[PDB]
């Protein structure tokens, strides 16, 4: 009959329905964690594993982002895979270093990606779940976090369509 | 150009499609965090807020579970709401005390619930997302965690149907 209080978190979860593809085609792009340059190509220039075994839990990827706007420099993200279940199409990662624009402002940014199949008997389709949390910090606000994260996720879903060779109309953000 | 390694996590995410209901109806049961006795009523005997304000971020619920078997005592869960966004039908909580069977064995059990509406042109329906993580510890394995958690989530989806007065066939586990 005792408990230990802890601090609250910031964050938000998003889900999209994607038609016209399959979960394992989506996963071939989205699940190749250390090669995120092959996914979010509107943002990421290059990417490679720098610690551990590629796409195995505990590994760290380092990726380079194009300048956020002209005149700016390239920035770098280090992120650690902290959970991976490839057969269940889901994983979890955290930013552990770098100066990547916006994202490096957050304290303990953790993200979850989980792909699910809608029932074949209902016409199929893929649900793409993507969430983040961050720890509240004096130098930021939850609204700022969401302003940083959501445009990136939106860009990434667009880039996904490009790499799957399906129209952008294939993706629909679900009402929460 | 440096980074610090962090520990990895155990866990799993699950998604169900629920037909014959609306996100508002589901939320009226699932979203009443401190009254989980009015949701998972086959497992939970009673539930009350014991710190903070009911269903506001930071609050702690105390709930009591029926005995696992005859002669066994009731067990107790303390869990803190660490994120709540009711407008977006999503929240996150962690066990912060108690001796609730199985769940109290995990180190830093954290759970996320999200509800999404499928497009009306598709026939509507709700996607129910539910995930957990726990920290690796000597006295458990990830498999043992999954064997604690998934049967409870399954029971909870069944109990949800009872309270919604809809048949269990309304619920389909995605990727079953
Ligand atoms: N780490 C991390 C972020 O989620 C991220 C940022 C840019 C492109 C892909 C992913
Ligand atoms: N806290 C917590 C667990 O997720 C839980 C355990 C039993 C019934 C409802 C919820």
Short mmCIF file of C-alpha atoms and ligand atoms in Angstrom, two decimals:
data_model
loop_
_atom_site.label_atom_id
_atom_site.label_comp_id
_atom_site.label_asym_id
_atom_site.label_seq_id
_atom_site.Cartn_x
_atom_site.Cartn_y
_atom_site.Cartn_z
CA UNK A 1 0.00 0.00 0.00
CA UNK A 2 2.62 2.48 -1.15
CA UNK A 3 3.62 4.00 -4.46
CA UNK A 4 6.39 6.08 -5.98
CA UNK A 5 5.37 9.15 -7.93
CA UNK A 6 7.22 9.98 -11.10
CA UNK A 7 7.21 12.84 -13.61
CA UNK A 8 4.78 13.12 -16.51
CA UNK A 9 5.71 12.96 -20.18
CA UNK A 10 5.04 14.97 -23.31
CA UNK A 11 4.05 13.27 -26.55
CA UNK A 12 1.49 12.27 -29.15
CA UNK A 13 0.47 9.24 -31.18
CA UNK A 14 -0.65 9.29 -34.82
CA UNK A 15 -2.14 6.60 -37.03
CA UNK A 16 -2.50 6.44 -40.83
CA UNK A 17 -4.35 4.02 -43.07
CA UNK A 18 -2.35 3.06 -46.15
CA UNK A 19 -4.01 1.38 -49.12
CA UNK A 20 -2.61 -0.10 -52.31
CA UNK A 21 0.41 -1.87 -50.82
CA UNK A 22 1.22 -4.66 -48.35
CA UNK A 23 2.55 -4.62 -44.80
CA UNK A 24 5.75 -6.37 -45.83
CA UNK A 25 6.44 -3.90 -48.64
CA UNK A 26 5.92 -1.04 -46.16
CA UNK A 27 8.11 -2.85 -43.64
CA UNK A 28 10.97 -3.33 -46.16
CA UNK A 29 11.32 0.46 -46.13
CA UNK A 30 10.18 1.48 -42.66
CA UNK A 31 11.75 -1.42 -40.77
CA UNK A 32 15.25 -1.02 -42.24
CA UNK A 33 16.21 1.08 -39.26
CA UNK A 34 19.87 1.77 -40.04
CA UNK A 35 19.04 2.73 -43.64
CA UNK A 36 16.52 5.48 -42.96
CA UNK A 37 18.13 7.36 -45.89
CA UNK A 38 16.24 4.88 -48.09
CA UNK A 39 12.99 5.99 -46.49
CA UNK A 40 12.87 9.67 -45.48
CA UNK A 41 14.89 10.82 -48.47
CA UNK A 42 13.38 14.33 -48.41
CA UNK A 43 15.29 14.91 -45.17
CA UNK A 44 18.01 12.30 -44.73
CA UNK A 45 21.13 12.30 -46.91
CA UNK A 46 22.96 9.27 -45.53
CA UNK A 47 22.72 6.75 -42.72
CA UNK A 48 24.71 3.89 -41.26
CA UNK A 49 25.09 1.71 -38.19
CA UNK A 50 27.79 2.98 -35.81
CA UNK A 51 27.31 0.68 -32.81
CA UNK A 52 26.07 -2.89 -32.52
CA UNK A 53 24.68 -5.14 -35.24
CA UNK A 54 22.46 -3.54 -37.90
CA UNK A 55 18.75 -3.42 -36.97
CA UNK A 56 19.33 -5.46 -33.82
CA UNK A 57 18.08 -4.09 -30.52
CA UNK A 58 20.72 -1.94 -28.85
CA UNK A 59 22.28 -0.80 -32.12
CA UNK A 60 22.92 2.86 -32.88
CA UNK A 61 22.45 4.52 -36.24
CA UNK A 62 24.05 7.79 -37.29
CA UNK A 63 22.35 9.73 -40.04
CA UNK A 64 23.00 13.05 -41.75
CA UNK A 65 20.24 15.51 -42.59
CA UNK A 66 20.22 18.04 -45.41
CA UNK A 67 20.21 21.71 -44.33
CA UNK A 68 16.81 22.56 -42.81
CA UNK A 69 16.71 25.75 -44.86
CA UNK A 70 19.23 27.43 -47.15
CA UNK A 71 22.35 28.87 -45.55
CA UNK A 72 22.10 26.32 -42.75
CA UNK A 73 24.49 23.41 -42.25
CA UNK A 74 23.92 19.67 -42.36
CA UNK A 75 22.97 18.16 -39.01
CA UNK A 76 23.50 14.73 -37.48
CA UNK A 77 21.27 12.31 -35.56
CA UNK A 78 22.43 9.41 -33.39
CA UNK A 79 19.58 7.15 -32.37
CA UNK A 80 19.51 3.84 -30.54
CA UNK A 81 17.15 0.99 -31.37
CA UNK A 82 15.73 0.03 -27.98
CA UNK A 83 13.14 -2.50 -29.10
CA UNK A 84 12.71 -4.49 -32.30
CA UNK A 85 10.18 -7.15 -33.26
CA UNK A 86 10.47 -7.48 -37.01
CA UNK A 87 7.98 -10.29 -37.43
CA UNK A 88 5.43 -8.16 -35.56
CA UNK A 89 6.48 -5.09 -37.60
CA UNK A 90 7.17 -2.89 -34.64
CA UNK A 91 10.11 -1.09 -33.07
CA UNK A 92 11.17 1.64 -30.68
CA UNK A 93 14.10 4.07 -30.80
CA UNK A 94 15.55 7.01 -28.91
CA UNK A 95 17.75 9.93 -29.90
CA UNK A 96 21.04 9.53 -28.03
CA UNK A 97 23.17 12.24 -29.66
CA UNK A 98 23.67 14.75 -32.45
CA UNK A 99 22.39 18.19 -33.38
CA UNK A 100 19.58 17.23 -35.73
CA UNK A 101 17.35 20.26 -36.27
CA UNK A 102 14.45 20.44 -33.82
CA UNK A 103 14.63 16.84 -32.65
CA UNK A 104 17.88 17.41 -30.76
CA UNK A 105 16.09 20.10 -28.71
CA UNK A 106 13.94 17.49 -26.98
CA UNK A 107 14.95 15.65 -23.83
CA UNK A 108 14.89 11.84 -24.20
CA UNK A 109 12.91 11.75 -27.44
CA UNK A 110 11.57 8.19 -27.78
CA UNK A 111 9.60 7.05 -30.80
CA UNK A 112 7.47 3.97 -31.53
CA UNK A 113 6.57 2.62 -34.95
CA UNK A 114 4.05 -0.22 -35.26
CA UNK A 115 2.53 -1.61 -38.49
CA UNK A 116 -0.68 -3.64 -38.47
CA UNK A 117 -2.74 -5.33 -41.19
CA UNK A 118 -6.42 -4.54 -41.48
CA UNK A 119 -8.34 -7.81 -41.85
CA UNK A 120 -8.13 -9.31 -45.35
CA UNK A 121 -11.82 -10.15 -45.02
CA UNK A 122 -12.52 -6.39 -44.75
CA UNK A 123 -10.45 -5.40 -47.79
CA UNK A 124 -7.02 -5.25 -46.18
CA UNK A 125 -4.86 -2.15 -45.85
CA UNK A 126 -2.09 -1.20 -43.43
CA UNK A 127 -2.32 0.81 -40.21
CA UNK A 128 0.84 2.80 -39.61
CA UNK A 129 1.13 3.83 -35.93
CA UNK A 130 3.81 6.38 -34.99
CA UNK A 131 4.17 7.97 -31.57
CA UNK A 132 6.73 9.89 -29.60
CA UNK A 133 7.39 10.97 -26.08
CA UNK A 134 9.75 13.51 -24.63
CA UNK A 135 10.56 14.56 -21.09
CA UNK A 136 9.26 17.99 -20.07
CA UNK A 137 12.08 20.51 -19.92
CA UNK A 138 12.20 24.21 -19.12
CA UNK A 139 13.72 25.15 -22.47
CA UNK A 140 10.83 23.72 -24.50
CA UNK A 141 7.07 23.22 -24.58
CA UNK A 142 4.87 20.29 -25.54
CA UNK A 143 3.38 22.37 -28.36
CA UNK A 144 6.88 22.97 -29.75
CA UNK A 145 7.57 19.23 -29.65
CA UNK A 146 4.47 18.55 -31.69
CA UNK A 147 5.37 21.33 -34.15
CA UNK A 148 8.77 19.65 -34.61
CA UNK A 149 7.57 16.08 -34.90
CA UNK A 150 4.34 16.10 -36.90
CA UNK A 151 5.68 17.76 -40.08
CA UNK A 152 8.54 15.23 -40.11
CA UNK A 153 6.19 12.26 -39.73
CA UNK A 154 3.99 13.75 -42.46
CA UNK A 155 6.99 14.17 -44.79
CA UNK A 156 8.07 10.60 -44.02
CA UNK A 157 4.67 9.17 -44.98
CA UNK A 158 4.90 11.10 -48.26
CA UNK A 159 8.42 9.77 -48.91
CA UNK A 160 7.17 6.27 -48.11
CA UNK A 161 4.68 6.56 -50.98
CA UNK A 162 7.44 7.66 -53.36
CA UNK A 163 9.58 4.64 -52.48
CA UNK A 164 6.62 2.24 -52.69
CA UNK A 165 5.62 3.74 -56.07
CA UNK A 166 2.08 4.35 -54.88
CA UNK A 167 0.15 7.62 -55.06
CA UNK A 168 0.16 10.00 -52.09
CA UNK A 169 -3.62 9.48 -52.00
CA UNK A 170 -2.82 6.01 -50.59
CA UNK A 171 -2.21 7.54 -47.15
CA UNK A 172 -4.94 8.89 -44.86
CA UNK A 173 -4.32 10.30 -41.39
CA UNK A 174 -6.96 8.82 -39.08
CA UNK A 175 -9.11 10.97 -36.83
CA UNK A 176 -8.10 10.56 -33.19
CA UNK B 1 29.56 13.62 -32.87
CA UNK B 2 29.10 11.59 -29.69
CA UNK B 3 26.36 9.60 -28.01
CA UNK B 4 25.58 7.70 -24.82
CA UNK B 5 24.14 4.19 -24.86
CA UNK B 6 20.92 3.47 -22.99
CA UNK B 7 19.33 0.23 -21.83
CA UNK B 8 16.95 -1.56 -24.16
CA UNK B 9 13.33 -2.47 -23.42
CA UNK B 10 11.01 -5.46 -23.48
CA UNK B 11 7.46 -5.09 -24.72
CA UNK B 12 4.86 -5.57 -27.40
CA UNK B 13 2.13 -3.59 -29.15
CA UNK B 14 -1.32 -4.90 -30.08
CA UNK B 15 -4.10 -3.51 -32.27
CA UNK B 16 -7.75 -4.48 -32.58
CA UNK B 17 -10.46 -3.36 -34.98
CA UNK B 18 -13.82 -2.86 -33.26
CA UNK B 19 -16.99 -2.71 -35.35
CA UNK B 20 -20.49 -1.72 -34.27
CA UNK B 21 -19.30 1.11 -32.04
CA UNK B 22 -17.89 4.64 -32.08
CA UNK B 23 -14.76 6.18 -30.66
CA UNK B 24 -16.88 8.18 -28.19
CA UNK B 25 -18.62 5.06 -26.88
CA UNK B 26 -15.35 3.19 -26.47
CA UNK B 27 -13.68 6.19 -24.84
CA UNK B 28 -16.49 6.58 -22.31
CA UNK B 29 -15.31 3.26 -20.84
CA UNK B 30 -11.61 3.12 -21.69
CA UNK B 31 -10.95 6.82 -21.07
CA UNK B 32 -12.27 6.77 -17.50
CA UNK B 33 -8.82 5.87 -16.24
CA UNK B 34 -9.50 6.00 -12.49
CA UNK B 35 -12.66 3.86 -12.90
CA UNK B 36 -11.06 0.89 -14.61
CA UNK B 37 -13.39 -1.22 -12.43
CA UNK B 38 -16.15 -0.12 -14.84
CA UNK B 39 -14.12 -1.49 -17.75
CA UNK B 40 -12.12 -4.64 -16.86
CA UNK B 41 -14.79 -5.67 -14.38
CA UNK B 42 -14.05 -9.40 -14.52
CA UNK B 43 -10.62 -8.68 -13.06
CA UNK B 44 -10.98 -5.41 -11.18
CA UNK B 45 -13.26 -5.20 -8.16
CA UNK B 46 -12.90 -1.49 -7.39
CA UNK B 47 -10.83 1.57 -8.35
CA UNK B 48 -10.35 5.08 -6.96
CA UNK B 49 -8.08 8.10 -7.42
CA UNK B 50 -5.53 8.40 -4.58
CA UNK B 51 -3.29 11.25 -5.77
CA UNK B 52 -4.08 14.21 -7.98
CA UNK B 53 -7.36 14.86 -9.76
CA UNK B 54 -9.35 12.10 -11.45
CA UNK B 55 -8.16 11.39 -15.01
CA UNK B 56 -5.77 14.34 -15.10
CA UNK B 57 -2.13 13.80 -16.00
CA UNK B 58 -0.08 12.98 -12.92
CA UNK B 59 -2.92 11.35 -11.02
CA UNK B 60 -2.57 7.92 -9.40
CA UNK B 61 -5.29 5.31 -9.33
CA UNK B 62 -5.51 2.49 -6.82
CA UNK B 63 -7.45 -0.54 -7.95
CA UNK B 64 -8.21 -3.86 -6.35
CA UNK B 65 -8.25 -7.18 -8.20
CA UNK B 66 -10.29 -10.26 -7.40
CA UNK B 67 -8.33 -13.20 -6.00
CA UNK B 68 -6.52 -15.29 -8.61
CA UNK B 69 -7.90 -18.41 -6.91
CA UNK B 70 -9.76 -19.46 -3.77
CA UNK B 71 -7.76 -18.76 -0.61
CA UNK B 72 -5.64 -16.20 -2.45
CA UNK B 73 -5.93 -12.60 -1.31
CA UNK B 74 -7.11 -9.65 -3.38
CA UNK B 75 -4.19 -7.77 -4.92
CA UNK B 76 -3.71 -4.04 -5.46
CA UNK B 77 -2.39 -1.90 -8.31
CA UNK B 78 -1.14 1.67 -8.09
CA UNK B 79 -0.66 3.31 -11.47
CA UNK B 80 0.13 6.85 -12.49
CA UNK B 81 -1.32 8.60 -15.54
CA UNK B 82 1.83 9.99 -17.17
CA UNK B 83 0.18 11.39 -20.31
CA UNK B 84 -3.43 12.15 -21.16
CA UNK B 85 -4.89 13.68 -24.29
CA UNK B 86 -8.61 13.07 -24.11
CA UNK B 87 -9.36 15.13 -27.22
CA UNK B 88 -7.04 12.75 -29.09
CA UNK B 89 -8.35 9.68 -27.23
CA UNK B 90 -4.95 8.54 -26.02
CA UNK B 91 -3.10 8.11 -22.78
CA UNK B 92 -0.13 6.53 -21.11
CA UNK B 93 0.33 5.09 -17.63
CA UNK B 94 2.87 3.26 -15.45
CA UNK B 95 2.59 0.93 -12.49
CA UNK B 96 4.11 2.73 -9.51
CA UNK B 97 3.21 0.33 -6.70
CA UNK B 98 1.12 -2.60 -5.54
CA UNK B 99 1.28 -6.37 -5.63
CA UNK B 100 -1.09 -7.01 -8.53
CA UNK B 101 -0.41 -10.53 -9.76
CA UNK B 102 2.21 -10.72 -12.49
CA UNK B 103 2.16 -7.03 -13.41
CA UNK B 104 3.85 -6.05 -10.14
CA UNK B 105 6.79 -8.32 -11.05
CA UNK B 106 7.75 -6.18 -14.00
CA UNK B 107 10.24 -3.36 -13.71
CA UNK B 108 8.75 -0.04 -14.82
CA UNK B 109 5.73 -1.41 -16.65
CA UNK B 110 4.51 1.38 -18.91
CA UNK B 111 1.42 1.13 -21.12
CA UNK B 112 -0.06 3.19 -23.97
CA UNK B 113 -3.65 3.20 -25.18
CA UNK B 114 -4.75 4.99 -28.37
CA UNK B 115 -8.11 5.02 -30.17
CA UNK B 116 -8.53 5.96 -33.84
CA UNK B 117 -11.58 6.16 -36.10
CA UNK B 118 -11.52 4.37 -39.43
CA UNK B 119 -12.86 6.41 -42.36
CA UNK B 120 -16.65 6.62 -42.55
CA UNK B 121 -16.52 5.76 -46.26
CA UNK B 122 -14.91 2.49 -45.19
CA UNK B 123 -17.72 1.69 -42.77
CA UNK B 124 -16.18 3.33 -39.73
CA UNK B 125 -15.10 1.30 -36.75
CA UNK B 126 -12.42 1.90 -34.15
CA UNK B 127 -8.77 0.91 -34.05
CA UNK B 128 -7.78 0.20 -30.46
CA UNK B 129 -3.99 0.30 -29.94
CA UNK B 130 -2.50 -1.00 -26.69
CA UNK B 131 1.19 -1.46 -26.00
CA UNK B 132 3.50 -2.03 -23.06
CA UNK B 133 7.17 -1.91 -22.22
CA UNK B 134 9.12 -3.16 -19.25
CA UNK B 135 12.78 -3.00 -18.31
CA UNK B 136 14.78 -6.21 -18.56
CA UNK B 137 15.27 -7.77 -15.14
CA UNK B 138 16.77 -10.95 -13.73
CA UNK B 139 13.53 -12.42 -12.39
CA UNK B 140 11.60 -12.35 -15.68
CA UNK B 141 12.01 -12.78 -19.43
CA UNK B 142 10.32 -10.88 -22.24
CA UNK B 143 8.31 -13.99 -23.02
CA UNK B 144 7.08 -14.16 -19.42
CA UNK B 145 6.04 -10.50 -19.63
CA UNK B 146 4.03 -11.15 -22.75
CA UNK B 147 2.36 -14.11 -21.04
CA UNK B 148 1.31 -11.81 -18.19
CA UNK B 149 0.14 -8.93 -20.31
CA UNK B 150 -1.57 -10.28 -23.41
CA UNK B 151 -4.15 -12.44 -21.63
CA UNK B 152 -5.17 -9.41 -19.57
CA UNK B 153 -5.49 -7.19 -22.65
CA UNK B 154 -7.56 -9.96 -24.26
CA UNK B 155 -9.85 -10.15 -21.21
CA UNK B 156 -10.15 -6.36 -21.23
CA UNK B 157 -11.26 -6.27 -24.87
CA UNK B 158 -13.89 -8.90 -23.98
CA UNK B 159 -15.06 -6.91 -20.96
CA UNK B 160 -15.24 -3.79 -23.13
CA UNK B 161 -17.78 -5.55 -25.37
CA UNK B 162 -19.84 -6.48 -22.33
CA UNK B 163 -20.02 -2.87 -21.22
CA UNK B 164 -20.77 -1.67 -24.76
CA UNK B 165 -23.49 -4.33 -25.07
CA UNK B 166 -22.00 -5.57 -28.35
CA UNK B 167 -20.99 -9.10 -29.25
CA UNK B 168 -17.37 -10.24 -28.83
CA UNK B 169 -17.31 -10.85 -32.58
CA UNK B 170 -17.19 -7.04 -32.82
CA UNK B 171 -13.52 -7.27 -31.92
CA UNK B 172 -10.86 -8.52 -34.30
CA UNK B 173 -7.22 -8.73 -33.26
CA UNK B 174 -5.12 -7.40 -36.14
CA UNK B 175 -2.50 -9.81 -37.49
CA UNK B 176 -4.02 -12.79 -35.72
N1 LIG C 1 15.58 9.76 -34.58
C1 LIG C 1 14.66 10.26 -35.06
C2 LIG C 1 13.46 10.92 -35.70
O1 LIG C 1 12.30 10.17 -35.42
C3 LIG C 1 13.65 11.09 -37.24
C4 LIG C 1 14.05 12.35 -37.75
C5 LIG C 1 14.25 12.55 -39.11
C6 LIG C 1 14.05 11.51 -40.00
C7 LIG C 1 13.66 10.26 -39.54
C8 LIG C 1 13.46 10.05 -38.17
N1 LIG C 2 -2.06 -0.74 -14.46
C1 LIG C 2 -2.26 -1.63 -15.16
C2 LIG C 2 -2.56 -2.80 -16.06
O1 LIG C 2 -2.40 -2.42 -17.41
C3 LIG C 2 -3.98 -3.40 -15.82
C4 LIG C 2 -4.11 -4.61 -15.10
C5 LIG C 2 -5.35 -5.17 -14.85
C6 LIG C 2 -6.50 -4.54 -15.31
C7 LIG C 2 -6.42 -3.35 -16.02
C8 LIG C 2 -5.16 -2.78 -16.27
#
